[PDB]
C-alpha cells in the first residue's frame, strides 16, 4: 500500500541527487510551514519538503532545470510547490516565511551578492522562523571561518558546523527571535 515520499522515493523515481542530509535533519526540528528554497537547484529539497507538509516556493536560475522541476511537480501532484525562475545575483524579494533554506548555492554567486541576499532572507523570515544555510568555506564565493555566524548575530544559533564535506562547508540552522 503506502510508499512514503521520502528522500529514497524521489531518488528511485526520478534519479536526481539525493535530498541534502541537513535538509532531512532540519525537517526533524522545523515544523511544517511556509518555506522558501532559495536556490533550489534540481528541486531535490523542495520535492521532499512539499511531499512532507511544507508549503514550498522554489527559486533558481536555469530555465531548463526549473521547467524540469515544474514537470516533476505536476507528475507528483504537488500543488503546494510553486516554482519561479530567478537570478540570485539581482533578486530582491518580499514575503514572510517560516523557513528559508539555501544549500550549496552561494559558492556560485558573486561575492558582492551575499551580504544583501542574507539580509533579504533575514527580513523575510517571521519571528520564530528558521534559516538553514549550507555553504562552502575557505569559485566566485566562499565564507571565511566564523563569517556565516557573524551575519546571524542576534539569532538563536541552534546548529553551526564547520566541517569537511575536498571542501569545508559551514552548516547553520538559526532561529529568529520572537
Ligand atoms: Cl555554497
CB 58 within 8 A of CB 82: yes
Q: Which experimental technique did the depositors report for determining this structure?
A: X-ray
Residue 161 Cα to ligand 1 midpoint, Å, equals 14
Question: What are the cell numbers at 106?
Answer: 552561494
- CA–chain centroid gap for 171, Å, is 12
What's the total number of domains in the chain?
Answer: 1
Structural domain harbouring 58 = 1-178
Residue 170 Cα to ligand 1 midpoint, Å, equals 8
CATH code for position 127 = 3.40.50.150
β-bridge pairing 168-175 and 156-164:
antiparallel
**What is the resolution of the experimental data for this entry, in Å?**
1.9
Give the span between the Cα atoms of 131 and 140, in whole angstroms: 23
List the beta strands (DSSP E) in 1-155: 34-38, 55-60, 81-85, 97-103, 125-136
Residue 108 Cα to ligand 1 midpoint, Å, equals 7
Question: What are the cell numbers at 14?
Answer: 526520478
Amino acid at each position: 500500500g503506502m510508499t512514503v515520499r521520502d528522500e529514497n522515493y524521489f531518488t528511485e523515481k526520478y534519479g536526481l541527487t539525493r535530498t541534502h542530509s541537513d535538509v532531512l535533519a532540519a525537517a526533524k526540528v522545523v515544523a511544517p510551514g511556509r518555506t522558501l528554497d532559495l536556490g533550489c537547484g534540481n528541486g531535490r529539497n523542495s520535492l521532499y519538503l512539499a511531499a512532507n507538509g511544507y508549503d514550498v516556493t522554489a527559486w533558481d536560475k536555469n530555465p531548463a532545470s526549473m521547467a524540469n522541476l515544474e514537470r516533476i511537480k505536476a507528475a507528483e501532484g504537488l500543488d503546494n510547490l510553486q516554482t519561479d525562475l530567478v537570478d540570485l545575483n539581482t533578486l530582491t524579494f518580499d514575503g514572510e516565511y517560516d523557513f528559508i533554506l539555501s544549500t550549496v548555492v552561494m559558492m556560485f554567486l558573486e561575492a558582492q551578492t551575499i551580504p544583501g541576499l542574507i539580509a533579504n532572507m533575514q527580513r523575510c523570515t517571521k519571528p520564530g522562523g528558521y534559516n538553514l544555510i549550507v555553504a562552502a568555506m575557505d569559485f566566485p564565493f566562499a565564507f571565511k571561518e566564523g563569517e556565516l555566524r557573524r551575519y546571524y548575530e542576534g539569532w538563536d544559533m541552534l546548529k553551526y558546523n564547520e566541517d569537511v564535506g575536498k571542501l569545508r562547508f559551514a552548516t547553520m540552522l538559526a532561529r529568529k527571535t520572537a
